[PDB]
Design a protein around this ligand. Structure first.
Ligand SMILES: [Mg+2]
Ligand SMILES: [Zn+2]
Ligand SMILES: [Zn+2]
Lengths: 164, 602, 87
RNA sequence: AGCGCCGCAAUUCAUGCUGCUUGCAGCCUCUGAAUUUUGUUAAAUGAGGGUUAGUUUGACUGUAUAAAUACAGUCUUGCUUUCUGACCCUGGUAGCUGCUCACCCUGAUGCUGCUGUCAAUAGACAGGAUAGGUGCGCUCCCAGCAAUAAGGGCGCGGAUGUAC
């Protein structure tokens, strides 16, 4: 062993509005974990691959968030802030993006999936629901490694000027 | 199980059939629907669920003001009475189901609390395992019904040592065990109980009895709504879809005639047996039956004529006919419904009333029951009830002069055990219990004899017809069929074979296993395994052992038990219930089932 | 089934402009024609569960489109449902 | 290949047979059990759809008998089903109407699979349950298709505030 070392893992700081799908994707990339791997590591199994698609029948339970809060050092109350608050309706399929936010903070925001959200009040821009250059839909936020459209390679920060 | 049904087609000219159809479909079934609706809204409905019992008269009281409502007013008195009986039996059924399910949920919730692992039992007792093992040995030596006695002992003994010792003693099947607890087999056994509690909790969200709307007005108005109106949200549109997919009820509720003399039999000049019903004597229906049942319908006239010749000095309490159901059977093709559908009468008879010796059995059963009633029962109408009971008790002594057939005599020491299994539906052992020897085994193949090929046919058709339905569903084709009638045929062939063997060896009884609810056991066992194998993957869990779970849901152990009970009662062979051992082959299970039922006689 | 002439007449009547062929208003007008004809069919053909499967799809499709239009503009939405005769 | 079924053959055996001693000891023809092989000119299974108020499976009484049942007489009705035979089909003419498809890749409990005249394209005509593969059959396998399982890729047009 390395003497006086504590068993450790690569951590990531969650951004102020980062979605759980985006967060788990970064944590998985930081540790080169497959989606099945993190679920086995937390012991919740295939559930992680389901959450990364925003498939929330059922929602992330107290048990499973506290389980993920054992391998991720982020506490379960902060993990619950990566999800819609109680009774806020959300949509999983059309993945959406502000772009002007992504130039400031490279994360998907869970509020971009709310059924009540359509503009960024900070930027006063209509949030995108597909790539404005090539019309390809955005991939699940767990897969936003490159920070660009997977088809035409336009960076999300440039898509800010193609909004509203 | 001496009650059986015999049936016949009822034939009449069209205006009689049309008049009856309109009474049933336009008045009687709407009345039943209204009674079901009002009864499900009654302020005592929630306390009826707690008792599990309906008040004896509440349906009759609700029907009284409806008998003169313009929606329902046009019916004979016995059709209102029939509607009352339909509704009353529906809720007697439904409240009995809910009551037992609730007791099951409460019982297993207590078991989940008192199912503690030895690691938990060490902390919760504060004693070493050997110390609680000794304390369990004492508590067993006092409780020496043992299971219930330990469940009784657990509740009020707040002493956590004895309470834990009872928990340890119950975990092992009411006995001591030296061997160590396999922690994963315990965790699985705990998980099974949680699944069972959850599945019981879900079954207790049963719907109230839905009725039969034959107009389907709700479907058409929902169609007009959903096509011309914006849905306020997804939940309204889903409720619209759920209505639009609901299939229409074609047929009214049958009529029920609980008074056997409300069917009045006659023979027309063309020599055919005829019947008319109290309140509808102008509608003569002609009996069209198989000869294999004709002797019953002839008996109904002879019983009626006997009591008329004696000026009612006989009792209809010994009439072979018990009650009738009047049913429309769905016809193939097209027409007006009174022409398309076939009017059918189902008569309950008690098979014992065929013979004179069996009638004497029923007479004593009637006399004891009525003498008990008259003694315990002691208003003007309640005194009239006593007088009718006393008239019955007097008149059942008058004989109908029925065919004499000496009752079956079976040796008390000879038993037939019937092992029931998923792979081998029945296996029998004839045991001479005082000799402790098997007189005969028979396999499933020997029981079916020349019919044994039907058993492979059933398996083959169940596969084939399921796949043809699966293919037909994707086309929205109506041609969806199944093997239920072949399965019923097989169970009746087995029942006759088992009883014939019992007669041949002069067995005193047939022993059948208390299987319990095999489907909920298997379903919770497999789910507990699958949740370990496919953690967090529901579809993987549901695919796991899917065909075994299907096979267990098709296993017709209840239908086979029922067929055996009926055939044994018709020959006067006693049915006994025993515990089927899990060890051994179907032959050994049948032997030990038989011998345990003998030893369990006390 | 729908004729090309009735189809193109729906396009022309609900178009936002002469080359608009796919705005949500045109889509709900197309679906409203289909739903009206199929409702008349199912009133007569209750056992046509194959065709009933289509209705539940078509009603859902129009429900999603109208909900989309309504939160673009209640003025356009209310005007549109009034023209189509939808409550 | 895999899986199910079918018989075949083989071993062991008792619910089979033999015996006096009636509880035991032999045996494997019969009648069965335990699943062990194997697909053969074998013996068994075999699933395209449809067609009768079809026949036999009854009731009572007497006689006989160890039950099981059997014989004789009288009466008889047609219900709801399960098989075995035999026979008929591969449908027609108008309406209404769903689903599917820009295109490409993968291929699903997807679709199709018979015979023989004719016939390059196209299918028609006449046969017909012998209907792709094995003893038989499958959602398996083979061949073609696959838009009408899921997915993935990627055009121009409309729309682009989450619907498409
Ligand atoms: Mg959507
Ligand atoms: Zn923004
Ligand atoms: Zn792009």
């Amino acid at each position: 062993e390395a003497p006086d070392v504590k068993p450790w893992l690569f951590l990531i700081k969650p951004y102020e509005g980062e979605s759980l799908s985006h967060f788990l994707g970064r944590f998985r990339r930081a540790n080169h974990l497959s989606a099945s791997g993190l679920g086995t590591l937390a012991g919740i199994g295939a559930i992680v691959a389901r959450w990364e698609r925003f498939h929330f029948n059922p929602r992330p339970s107290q048990q499973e968030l506290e389980a993920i809060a054992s391998v991720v050092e982020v506490d379960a109350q902060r993990l619950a802030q990566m999800l819609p608050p109680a009774g806020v309706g959300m949509q999983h399929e059309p993945i959406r993006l502000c772009g002007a936010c992504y130039a400031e903070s490279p994360c998907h925001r869970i509020e971009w999936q709310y059924k009540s959200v359509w503009k960024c009040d900070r930027h006063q821009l209509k949030i995108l629901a597909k790539c404005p250059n090539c019309q390809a839909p955005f991939k699940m936020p767990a897969l936003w490694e490159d920070g660009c459209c997977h088809r035409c390679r336009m960076p999300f920060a440039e898509m800010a000027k193609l909004q509203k | 199980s001496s009650q059986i049904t015999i049936q016949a087609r009822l034939i009449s000219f069209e205006s009689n059939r049309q008049q009856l159809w309109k009474l049933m479909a336009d008045l009687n079934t709407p009345l039943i629907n209204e009674l079901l609706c009002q009864l499900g809204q009654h302020p005592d409905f929630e306390k009826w669920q707690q008792k599990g019992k309906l008040p004896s008269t509440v349906v009759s009281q609700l029907c009284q003001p409806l008998k003169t409502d313009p929606r329902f007013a046009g019916q004979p008195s016995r059709l209102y009475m029939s509607a009352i009986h339909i509704v009353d039996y529906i809720y007697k059924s439904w409240l009995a189901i809910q009551k037992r399910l609730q007791q099951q949920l409460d019982g297993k919730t207590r078991w989940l609390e008192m199912l503690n692992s030895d690691a938990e039992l060490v902390e919760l007792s504060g004693d070493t395992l050997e110390a609680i093992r000794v304390k369990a040995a004492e508590i067993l030596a006092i409780a020496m019904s043992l299971s219930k006695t330990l469940f009784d002992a657990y509740q009020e003994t707040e002493d956590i040592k004895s309470r834990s010792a009872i928990s340890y003693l119950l975990k092992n099947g009411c006995k001591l065990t030296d061997k160590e607890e396999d922690s994963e087999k315990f965790a699985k056994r705990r998980r099974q109980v949680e699944i069972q509690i959850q599945r019981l909790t879900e079954k207790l969200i049963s719907r109230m009895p839905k009725g039969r709307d034959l107009t389907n007005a709700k479907w058409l108005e929902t169609l007009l709504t959903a096509t011309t109106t914006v849905a306020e949200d997804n939940a309204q549109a889903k409720r619209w879809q759920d209505i639009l997919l609901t299939r229409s009820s074609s047929l009214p509720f049958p009529l029920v005639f609980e008074t056997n003399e409300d069917m009045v039999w006659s023979k027309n000049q063309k020599g055919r047996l005829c019947v008319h019903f109290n309140g509808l004597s102008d509608l003569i229906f002609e009996v069209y039956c198989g000869n294999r049942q004709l002797h019953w319908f002839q008996r109904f006239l002879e019983d009626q004529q006997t009591k008329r010749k004696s000026k009612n000095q006989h009792s209809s309490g010994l009439f072979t006919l018990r009650n009738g159901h009047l049913v429309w059977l769905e016809g193939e093709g097209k027409g007006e419904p009174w022409n398309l559908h076939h009017l059918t009468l189902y008569c309950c008879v008690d098979n014992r009333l065929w013979t004179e010796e069996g009638t004497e059995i029923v007479r004593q059963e009637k006399a004891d029951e009525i003498t008990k009633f008259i003694t315990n029962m002691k208003s003007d109408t309640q005194q009239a009830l006593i007088q009718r009971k006393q008239s019955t008790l007097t008149r059942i002594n008058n004989s109908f002069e029925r065919p004499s057939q000496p009752l079956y005599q079976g040796q008390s020491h000879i038993l037939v055990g019937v092992s029931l299994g998923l792979e081998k539906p029945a296996t029998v052992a004839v045991v001479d219990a005082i000799a402790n020897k098997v007189l005969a085994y028979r396999s499933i193949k020997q029981l079916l004899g020349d019919n044994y090929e039907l058993l492979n046919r059933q398996r083959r058709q169940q596969q084939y017809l399921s796949h043809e339905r699966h293919k037909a569903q994707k086309n929205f084709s109506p041609n969806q069929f199944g093997a239920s009638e072949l399965g019923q045929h097989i169970d009746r062939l087995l029942a006759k074979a088992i009883v014939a063997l019992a007669r041949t060896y002069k067995a005193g009884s047939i022993v059948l296993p208390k299987l319990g609810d095999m489907r909920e056991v298997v379903q919770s066992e497999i789910q507990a395994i699958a949740e370990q194998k496919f953690p967090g993957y529901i579809e993987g869990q549901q695919k796991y052992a899917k065909q075994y779970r299907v096979n267990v849901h098709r296993w017709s152990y209840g239908r086979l038990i029922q067929s055996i009970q009926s055939k044994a009662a018709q020959t006067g062979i006693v049915i006994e219930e025993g515990k089927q051992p899990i060890r051994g082959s179907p032959h050994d299970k049948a032997k030990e089932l038989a011998l345990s039922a003998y030893n369990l006689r006390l | 089934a729908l004729t090309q002439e009735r189809k193109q007449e729906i396009i022309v009547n609900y178009q936002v402009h002469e080359t608009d062929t796919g705005s949500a208003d045109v889509q709900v007008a197309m679906l409203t024609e289909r739903i009206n004809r199929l409702s008349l069919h199912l009133q007569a053909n209750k056992k046509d569960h194959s065709s009933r499967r289509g209705l539940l799809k078509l009603i859902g499709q129009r429900k999603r489109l109208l909900a989309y239009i309504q939160k673009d503009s209640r003025e356009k939405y209310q005007a549109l449902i009034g023209r189509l005769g939808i409550r």
